[PDB]
Design a protein around this ligand. Structure first.
Ligand SMILES: [Zn+2]
Lengths: 135, 178, 61, 189, 325
């Protein structure tokens, strides 16, 4: 079940790895991105809200997605990394790095590593006050 | 054979040139990856050849060279070569508190302290490496250690004096089964 | 399952009261798998251990 | 040929576990006529591994305070216990002693890590020298509480403890204590 | 086939290619690296020690003063050069060799002296460092007697004479391109790339100039016709009054002025090595910093540290809230 491709050529999907500051999403989609293939959160692998954004949950998520994509015939993935963006922080967290490495171990050819974080041109006001944020 | 390209700024060209042997030797010796530096595109290129021992070594080398470009020492990113459970988390200094001008500079000062001492103290307690780019903070360490270091740094850049931060991080490091 | 062991290098004295010895372990199963383990009592270069279970790794990092 | 107490052979003794083989010192050059030697054996670290194991059993038999200096009594009790072992089992009593030491010593033990107040223990491995030492100590202690207030002579009780530990049955004090220690260590990890 | 200190320092297993293996005692006794001294106690002993009579040493000295490399070489370098000269005279005919070397010709270009050409990893527009090129990237690679020398100045004077030289590779070298430092006040050239004050006039004025030496005996020098090199922009600025004591750091105006001793502690100057077999036993991934010593409070730094700060011109604008040590 999958594309009818010779062994020389690879099937490309686009893996959106979005690491929010509470968990991590692994969302493999079409090259267009409209039709999806797989997605497992940090929360569907570990049964605790404390360890939701942990690299353990992210790497288990990446192995689950890699196995599912081997089942459906996709052999290679382009990578579109993401942080929360906008007013929030712009750098993808350690969970995104952990998911990327874990899907790199799991037999996947890697295509283009590209960061799409929604950087504002000129943002609205920060969620925190004037006093500060994050302890 | 796949490749990864990472950029280098103008202020990291000379550290790249001086430390070049110490960068390319560990990548090609035991990881078995081709490496070059394109002067036209200003990119470090890392490639997989037939001599590559295992998969995902190129990701390890990419994290190593990226950490060196962000401002870390060559041995502190050779730690990323050897160890598996190490990450590179970074944030802007205005991400937690909107600081304008001179206030912002003072915040930078109380990440460093006098002689850098405060920064080194955190590096002694959290077992991390912190790099202060001009308005950026980069932490290299384990995930829990990154959390402790970012808690200390965020406490410093919203107003807390260094002694309170030292006491808090020493209590947390005592509680963290270190 | 029980597997016998080898001593490659004595590493140090750790523990609360300095009672445990951190030591490198080679295997008698003709493998080069060296694991760091904590032992209780006096050990020297030339000892043979008896690991009740070998999947455990000591306090590394 | 050198025979312990003039009658007991030492070449028939075989070591089952090779980790304790280099420390149970009984086989060829370490066989003596009598358990009594009075040599300087605690002068330097690991020198007591070179000691004949019958001398170790004798030296751990004088432990309690009222017998704390009498060694000729301990060696004659060792001789009598070897007689009891030989008439009960029929084997070489040195082999029974070695099997008891092998089956008595715990392989892993709990220990305290952290600071004063840390009430959780980590399971660690046990050194072979410490394993032999604690096996001898537990066998002698089993001989002690096996013969406090009863008609049975302590030579008979020492022989019974040695035979029960060599057989591995759940009757020896040393076997029960080893099982308890290993279960506690497996529960802690 | 004479061996310099660079052969044993770079671990040249080249005893098989040669048969006249001759070394001085001072080239083998001055080595401080423990690994190669251990190697010398293991290596097969076909080398034999030989001392030159000093007429060859005299002649090597008077053309060392003529080739412009006499301040660059040391005494043991002169001894090794006299050794290979006297064996070439003893075994081979002496008439093959020309004395009083030729005149250098000038050919300048617009390239900066800091252009990173002939660096193995760097590539302009393919140049790759591969696992199959590590043993071969040493230098520009190209019968009975030879040398095992890596220092450039000896090679420069030696090919000015005309003896064939070899390296830890097999085949001999015909062309040698490298860099020298030239004073633009007194026009005296030095082959020592480490030094920053010239030996003749003592000013901090040495600048990089590239040189190429042929096997025939022709030296030629490439200068840079770039005005950025000879620009007096950040050279004049106000200096503070000279200060003494245990903590003064003077602006380093001469090569031999007496600085106070301000050394880093041993805990401060340990860098972590990660490939040690006992590294994983450590409680931390990195070496603990020094925050307790007196050298930490005095903000003592390593000599190699902060090089780009010194390269900025002092008559410029730093950031408002920073202090430059
Ligand atoms: Zn000059």
């Amino acid at each position: 079940l999958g594309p009818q491709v010779a062994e020389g050529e690879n099937v490309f999907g686009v893996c959106h790895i979005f690491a929010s500051f509470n968990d991590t999403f692994v969302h493999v989609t079409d090259l267009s991105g409209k039709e999806t293939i797989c997605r497992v959160t940090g929360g569907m692998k570990v049964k605790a809200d404390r360890d939701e954004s942990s690299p353990y949950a992210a790497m288990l998520a990446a192995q689950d997605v890699a196995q599912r994509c081997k089942e459906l015939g996709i052999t290679a993935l382009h990578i579109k990394l993401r942080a929360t963006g906008g007013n929030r922080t712009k750098t993808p967290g350690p969970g995104a790095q952990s998911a990327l490495r874990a899907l790199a171990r799991s037999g996947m050819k890697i295509g283009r590593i590209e960061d799409v974080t929604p950087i504002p041109s000129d943002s609205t006001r920060r969620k925190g006050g004037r006093r500060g944020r994050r302890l | 054979e796949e490749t990864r390209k990472i950029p280098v700024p103008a202020n990291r060209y000379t550290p790249l040139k001086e430390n070049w042997m110490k960068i390319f030797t560990p990548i090609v010796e035991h990881l078995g990856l081709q490496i070059r530096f394109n002067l036209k595109s200003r990119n470090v290129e890392i490639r997989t050849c037939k001599e590559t021992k295992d998969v995902s070594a190129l990701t390890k080398a990419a994290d190593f060279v990226k950490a060196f470009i962000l401002g870390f020492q060559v041995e502190d990113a050779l730690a990323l070569i050897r160890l598996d459970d190490l990450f590179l988390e970074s944030f802007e200094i205005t991400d937690v508190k909107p600081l304008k001008g001179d206030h912002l500079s003072r915040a930078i000062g109380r990440i460093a302290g006098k002689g850098g001492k405060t920064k080194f103290t955190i590096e002694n307690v959290t077992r991390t490496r912190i790099v202060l780019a001009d308005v950026k903070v980069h932490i290299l360490g384990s995930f829990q250690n990154i959390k402790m270091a970012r808690t200390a740094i965020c406490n410093l850049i919203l107003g807390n004096p260094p002694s309170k931060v030292y006491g808090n991080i020493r209590a947390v490091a005592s509680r963290s089964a270190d | 399952p029980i597997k016998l062991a080898r001593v490659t290098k004595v590493l140090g004295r750790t523990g609360s009261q300095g009672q445990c010895t951190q030591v490198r372990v080679e295997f008698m199963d003709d493998t080069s798998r060296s694991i760091i383990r904590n032992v209780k009592g006096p050990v020297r270069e030339g000892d043979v251990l008896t690991l009740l279970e070998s999947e455990r790794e000591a306090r590394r990092l | 040929d050198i025979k312990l107490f003039g009658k007991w052979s030492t070449d028939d003794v075989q070591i089952n576990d090779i980790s304790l083989q280099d420390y149970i010192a009984v086989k060829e050059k370490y066989a003596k006529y009598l358990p009594h030697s009075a040599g300087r054996y605690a002068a330097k670290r690991f020198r007591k591994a070179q000691c004949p194991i019958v001398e170790r059993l004798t030296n751990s038999m004088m432990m309690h305070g009222r017998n704390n200096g009498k060694k000729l009594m301990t060696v004659r009790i060792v001789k009598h216990a070897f007689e009891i072992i030989h008439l009960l089992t029929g084997e070489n009593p040195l082999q029974v002693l070695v099997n008891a030491i092998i089956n008595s010593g715990p392989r892993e033990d709990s220990t305290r890590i952290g600071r004063a107040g840390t009430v959780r223990r980590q399971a660690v491995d046990v050194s072979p020298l410490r394993r032999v030492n604690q096996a001898i100590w537990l066998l002698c202690t089993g001989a002690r509480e096996a013969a406090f207030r009863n008609i049975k002579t302590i030579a008979e009780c020492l022989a019974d403890e040695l035979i029960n530990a060599a057989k591995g049955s759940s009757n020896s004090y040393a076997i029960k204590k080893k099982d308890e220690l290993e279960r506690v260590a497996k529960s802690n990890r | 086939v004479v061996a310099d200190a660079g052969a044993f320092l770079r671990h040249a297993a080249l005893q098989d290619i040669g048969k006249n293996i001759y070394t001085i005692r001072e080239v083998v006794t001055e080595i401080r690296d423990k690994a190669t001294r251990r190697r010398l106690a293991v290596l097969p002993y076909e080398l034999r020690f030989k001392e030159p009579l000093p007429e060859y040493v005299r002649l090597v000295t008077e053309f060392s003063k003529k080739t412009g490399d006499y301040p660059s070489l040391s005494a043991t370098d002169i001894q090794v050069l006299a050794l290979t000269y006297q064996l070439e005279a003893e075994f081979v005919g002496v008439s093959h060799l020309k004395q009083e070397p030729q005149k250098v010709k000038v050919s300048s270009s617009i390239q900066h002296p800091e252009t990173p050409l002939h660096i193995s990893g760097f590539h302009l527009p393919g140049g790759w460092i591969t696992p199959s090129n590590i043993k071969q990237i040493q230098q520009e690679l190209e019968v009975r007697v030879g040398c095992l020398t890596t220092d450039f100045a000896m090679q420069n004077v030696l090919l000015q004479m005309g003896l064939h030289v070899l390296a830890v590779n097999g085949m001999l070298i015909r062309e040698a391109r490298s860099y020298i430092l030239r004073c633009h006040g007194c026009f005296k050239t030095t082959s020592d790339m480490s030094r920053v004050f010239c030996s003749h006039c003592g000013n901090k004025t040495l600048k990089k100039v590239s040189v190429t030496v042929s096997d025939d005996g022709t030296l030629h020098m490439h200068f840079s016709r770039n005005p950025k090199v000879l620009n007096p922009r950040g050279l004049r600025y106000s200096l503070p009054t000279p200060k003494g004591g245990k903590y003064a750091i003077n602006p380093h105006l001469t090569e031999d002025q007496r600085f106070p001793q301000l050394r880093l502690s041993q805990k401060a100057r340990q860098k972590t090595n990660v490939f040690a077999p006992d590294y994983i036993a450590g409680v931390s991934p990195f070496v603990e910093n020094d925050i307790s010593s007196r050298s930490a409070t005095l903000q003592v730094r390593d000599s190699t540290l902060g090089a780009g700060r010194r390269r900025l011109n002092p008559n410029a604008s730093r950031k408002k809230f920073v202090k430059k040590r």
